[PDB]
Amino acid sequence: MPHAFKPGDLVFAKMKGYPHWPARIDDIADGAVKPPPNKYPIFFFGTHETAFLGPKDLFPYDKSKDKYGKPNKRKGFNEGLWEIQNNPHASYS
């Protein structure tokens, strides 16, 4: 059965006006800006941007890849597919 989201979990994350996007739940580094309550730090593969999202916008990668894991015209998306599949836990700093 599902647990709560934890750092390292892989997802497609949904933001308004964007396709479901390969992403991971990030850690918050010591000394770094924390998310608002009920929000997780989301690292988007390919674009390498962070946004804060709640679970309603987080789709677990294993369950969702057959729907959302397909090339997209959007900038950085295809890079993003490679990253989540090939090295999703790497430093992209």
UniProtKB/Swiss-Prot annotation:
Domain PWWP: 7-64
Tissue spec: Widely expressed. High expression is found in heart, skeletal muscle, ovary and testis. Overexpression is frequently observed in hepatocellular carcinoma samples.
Subcellular location: Nucleus; Cytoplasm
Function: Acts as an epigenetic regulator of myogenesis in cooperation with DPF3a (isoform 2 of DPF3/BAF45C). Associates with the BAF complex via its interaction with DPF3a and HDGFL2-DPF3a activate myogenic genes by increasing chromatin accessibility through recruitment of SMARCA4/BRG1/BAF190A (ATPase subunit of the BAF complex) to myogenic gene promoters. Promotes the repair of DNA double-strand breaks (DSBs) through the homologous recombination pathway by facilitating the recruitment of the DNA endonuclease RBBP8 to the DSBs.
Assembly and oligomerization: Interacts with HDGF. Interacts with trimethylated 'Lys-36' of histone H3 (H3K36me3). Interacts with trimethylated 'Lys-79' of histone H3 (H3K79me3), but has higher affinity for H3K36me3. Interacts with IWS1. Interacts with H2AX, POGZ, RBBP8 and CBX1. Interacts with histones H3K9me3, H3K27me3 and H3K36me2. Interacts with DPF3a (isoform 2 of DPF3/BAF45C). Interacts with SMARCA4/BRG1/BAF190A, SMARCC1/BAF155 and SMARCD1/BAF60A in a DPF3a-dependent manner.
Family: Belongs to the HDGF family.
Name of the protein: Hepatoma-derived growth factor-related protein 2
Organism of this sequence: Homo sapiens
Lineage, highest ranks first: Eukaryota, Metazoa, Chordata, Craniata, Vertebrata
Gene: HDGFL2
Stretch of the intact protein here: 1 to 93 of 671
